[PDB]
Amino acid sequence: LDDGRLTDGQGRTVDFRNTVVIMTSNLGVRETERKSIGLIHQDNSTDAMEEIKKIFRP
Amino acid sequence: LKKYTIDLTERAEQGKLDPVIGRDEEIRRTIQVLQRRTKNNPVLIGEPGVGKTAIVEGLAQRIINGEVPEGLKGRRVLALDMGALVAGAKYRGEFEERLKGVLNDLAKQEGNVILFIDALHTMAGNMLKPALARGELHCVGATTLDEYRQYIEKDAALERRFQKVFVAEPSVEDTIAILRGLKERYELHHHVQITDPAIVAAATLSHRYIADRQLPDKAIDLIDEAASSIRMQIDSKPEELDRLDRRIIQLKLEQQALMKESDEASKKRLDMLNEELSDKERQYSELEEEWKAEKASLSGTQTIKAELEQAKIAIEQARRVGDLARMSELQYGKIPELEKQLEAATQLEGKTMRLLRNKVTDAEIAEVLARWTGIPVSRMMESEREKLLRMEQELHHRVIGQNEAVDAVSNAIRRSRAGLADPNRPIGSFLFLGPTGVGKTELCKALANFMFDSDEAMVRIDMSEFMEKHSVSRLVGAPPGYVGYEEGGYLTEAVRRRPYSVILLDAVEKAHPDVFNILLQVLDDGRLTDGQGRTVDFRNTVVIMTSNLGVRETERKSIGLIHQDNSTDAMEEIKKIFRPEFINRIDEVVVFHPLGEQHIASIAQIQLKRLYKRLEERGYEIHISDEALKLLSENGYDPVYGARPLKRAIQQQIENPLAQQILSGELVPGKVIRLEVNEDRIVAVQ
Amino acid sequence: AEQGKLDPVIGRDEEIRRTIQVLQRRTKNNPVLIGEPGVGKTAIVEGLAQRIINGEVP
Amino acid sequence: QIDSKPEELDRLDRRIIQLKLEQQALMKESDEASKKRLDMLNEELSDKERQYSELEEE
Numbered sequence A: 001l002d003d004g005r006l007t008d009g010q011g012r013t014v015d016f017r018n019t020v021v022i023m024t025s026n027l028g029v030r031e032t033e034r035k036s037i038g039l040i041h042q043d044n045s046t047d048a049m050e051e052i053k054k055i056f057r058p
Numbered sequence B: 001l002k003k004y005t006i007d008l009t010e011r012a013e014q015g016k017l018d019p020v021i022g023r024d025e026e027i028r029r030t031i032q033v034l035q036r037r038t039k040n041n042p043v044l045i046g047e048p049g050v051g052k053t054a055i056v057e058g059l060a061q062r063i064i065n066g067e068v069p070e071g072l073k074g075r076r077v078l079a080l081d082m083g084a085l086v087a088g089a090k091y092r093g094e095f096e097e098r099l100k101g102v103l104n105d106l107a108k109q110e111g112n113v114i115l116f117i118d119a120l121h122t123m124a125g126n127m128l129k130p131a132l133a134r135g136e137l138h139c140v141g142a143t144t145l146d147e148y149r150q151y152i153e154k155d156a157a158l159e160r161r162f163q164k165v166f167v168a169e170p171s172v173e174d175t176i177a178i179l180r181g182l183k184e185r186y187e188l189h190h191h192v193q194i195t196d197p198a199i200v201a202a203a204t205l206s207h208r209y210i211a212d213r214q215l216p217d218k219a220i221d222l223i224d225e226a227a228s229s230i231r232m233q234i235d236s237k238p239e240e241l242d243r244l245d246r247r248i249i250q251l252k253l254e255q256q257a258l259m260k261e262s263d264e265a266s267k268k269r270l271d272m273l274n275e276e277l278s279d280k281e282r283q284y285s286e287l288e289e290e291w292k293a294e295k296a297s298l299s300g301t302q303t304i305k306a307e308l309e310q311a312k313i314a315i316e317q318a319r320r321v322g323d324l325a326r327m328s329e330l331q332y333g334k335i336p337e338l339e340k341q342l343e344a345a346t347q348l349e350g351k352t353m354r355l356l357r358n359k360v361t362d363a364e365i366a367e368v369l370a371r372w373t374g375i376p377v378s379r380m381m382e383s384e385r386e387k388l389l390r391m392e393q394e395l396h397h398r399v400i401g402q403n404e405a406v407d408a409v410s411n412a413i414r415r416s417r418a419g420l421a422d423p424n425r426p427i428g429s430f431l432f433l434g435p436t437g438v439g440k441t442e443l444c445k446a447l448a449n450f451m452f453d454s455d456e457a458m459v460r461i462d463m464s465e466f467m468e469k470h471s472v473s474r475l476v477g478a479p480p481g482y483v484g485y486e487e488g489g490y491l492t493e494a495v496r497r498r499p500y501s502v503i504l505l506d507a508v509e510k511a512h513p514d515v516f517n518i519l520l521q522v523l524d525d526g527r528l529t530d531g532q533g534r535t536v537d538f539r540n541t542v543v544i545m546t547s548n549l550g551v552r553e554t555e556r557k558s559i560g561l562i563h564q565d566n567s568t569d570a571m572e573e574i575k576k577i578f579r580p581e582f583i584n585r586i587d588e589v590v591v592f593h594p595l596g597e598q599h600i601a602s603i604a605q606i607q608l609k610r611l612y613k614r615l616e617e618r619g620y621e622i623h624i625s626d627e628a629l630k631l632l633s634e635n636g637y638d639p640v641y642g643a644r645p646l647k648r649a650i651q652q653q654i655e656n657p658l659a660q661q662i663l664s665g666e667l668v669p670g671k672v673i674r675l676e677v678n679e680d681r682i683v684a685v686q
Numbered sequence C: 001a002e003q004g005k006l007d008p009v010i011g012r013d014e015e016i017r018r019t020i021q022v023l024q025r026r027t028k029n030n031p032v033l034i035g036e037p038g039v040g041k042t043a044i045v046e047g048l049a050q051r052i053i054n055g056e057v058p
Numbered sequence D: 001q002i003d004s005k006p007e008e009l010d011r012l013d014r015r016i017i018q019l020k021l022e023q024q025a026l027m028k029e030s031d032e033a034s035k036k037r038l039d040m041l042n043e044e045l046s047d048k049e050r051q052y053s054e055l056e057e058e
């Protein structure tokens, strides 16, 4: 995510400079079911960002 | 004895030895070990390049200069030659025929012969044991540290016999003394001269920088390679000579182009070409005549070099064998005459040698070394104090902004490199507050590129990175003796390219107080006992520690207001959350701020400089207005992250529509773009 | 190289003078060209040999 | 230490060998009149030969 490279086993890198890493996430489902509609979007950015802060890095 | 063994009486007597310099401790230890009644097979712990074979050459200068004690005199010491023992073996098994014949005659010799095994670690293994164990011979050895550690300790009678002696690589002034003792063979073998600061700077800087190679080995690479460079380029013809040689060969070929004519009155113009040919031939003849004049000085000094080395070998052999009239004959007589007209020969090269340079100085060492390494020579021409006082200028070449950071951090680096902190500290004891993406990695690249000379030099640590207690075992990899000798440590990789590091220790306050104590051991003592327990010198490591406490008020207090206000009321928060010991550790408190209005315009236009060059290759030139980039700015200025959705709103707001407008056919290349001012969504117009 | 069946070594003079300075050394005399291949190691040897046969060699 | 010779006979032996190697150089003299000075070196040299005889007898 910083480089588009991956320092693999022998000491080389892996060429990721022109491809895309993709990740479907199973966390913010019911939070999105709570924000829509009638609840503010940045509130779900807030507390969904909070459980991300329990489980991810920013 | 004879055909496959050689007496060192006649090898040290013949003098196949390079001169040695003051090798006292190891040779006297060799004497007292060789006077033990058993385990008198001393093994020298070291590698060649400290000159272990040369230490044996000097013990042979103490046999042949008579400087050995009463114990080791009278002994008739014959050396084995396995390279002679391979001779006469055709059918399979005659080398060990002649080898056990060596066991026959050195068996009957019964103690008369001390053995020296050149390259002991040639000496198999089950058959070297019974002759020594019965006592049939007497030898001396030498091998590598690691080879020795895998050599003695296991076997019973092998650690009974083979013996430890501390022999090491010297300090500065002793390697200086070795190069002084060897400039006899250097100068009088390599057609060169050597002065004292070349030896002092060679042994000193070679001692300091390269902790890899050996002393005086790498200085032997310098004097050997560079001295032959001086001899070789002295053999070459000078520069004005071959400038004029190219000009006369072009003028002769053009004269041949002028002689073959069809129209006479147009092609008989070559008279001025002929007189210019005569003048340039005269000048080239005079300059090559000067080259032969310097070769005449080198002719006389060449034959007096030959008779000179014959003269000092004559006075030393006169010291050795002892003819009476020949000693005083040479002493008052032949050799001081060659000393006086040797001085007249040094004045002969001191007045004849104009083009070719016989004397070797540090500049040719900077030639051979400047084409060895490849690091810029101006970085050695730089001093520390000058690149401390002129740091703001080159920091204002690349990086724009951060005035109190460059000035006050420059005060911390002038204090730190000046020594105005505790010298038991790392280099930069910092504390940085502010958001991410304002140039911290860019500051590591800029300082790394200036004083560390790299666009590749930064590793960064946020506290959520932390590869764990097991990870120090991961960079030592497997313990030694397991699988993984193919890689081992990737310590060898990330520390292959960068021995130093500039580290961006993010969010120091959000870490545990155990990281206030581990990082207190970082800021104190200039070294950290890590999770494994060993410690590595942080005194060659700037400990840059960054943080993200007060984001919003720092994003406000940037334009117009003084920044010492933000630093001091930041320290009103720092005093509460830290101990006063941490405030004692760091020198000053610097807080990074997001830049001002015209400098935010500098940030957006620098992020669009990629678009200027990516597009100026393809044939598009934007002249973006301040108002279209301003709609990029205020449509980018989200107070959440700072300038981090500013790139998202530049590339997403214009450039994805600008990729649709350029890549659709609306923007024709070869024409100057001005990003105009419509409604708030921005549309490029040709 | 005397029949002319080969190709010239053009430019890159720090490398050719580098190997020649390695050659002229007495102790540690012989060279090794070392790199990840495809930089012209035998072709740098051809830089030496073409410099020798051209007569412009020091 | 039992098998060798002590220190003061080494010091006196080196200074006597040095002065008699100076004597071999000073017998073949260039100017016999201006070089009369070595008479004290001859008398003190004979004194060192007497002391050398005593110490070597010991």
Ligand SMILES: Nc1ncnc2c1ncn2[C@@H]1O[C@H](COP(=O)(O)OP(=O)(O)OP(O)(O)=S)[C@@H](O)[C@H]1O
Pocket: C037, C038, C039, C040, C041, C042, C043, C044
């Ligand atoms: N700098 C260069 N100069 C000339 N040719 C080069 C260069 N770099 C790569 N090449 C090409 O790459 C090849 C590799 O160079 P070589 O002359 O074969 O040196 P090499 O690495 O010793 O290869 P060998 O002989 O198989 S070990 C050359 O034959 C050229 O086709």
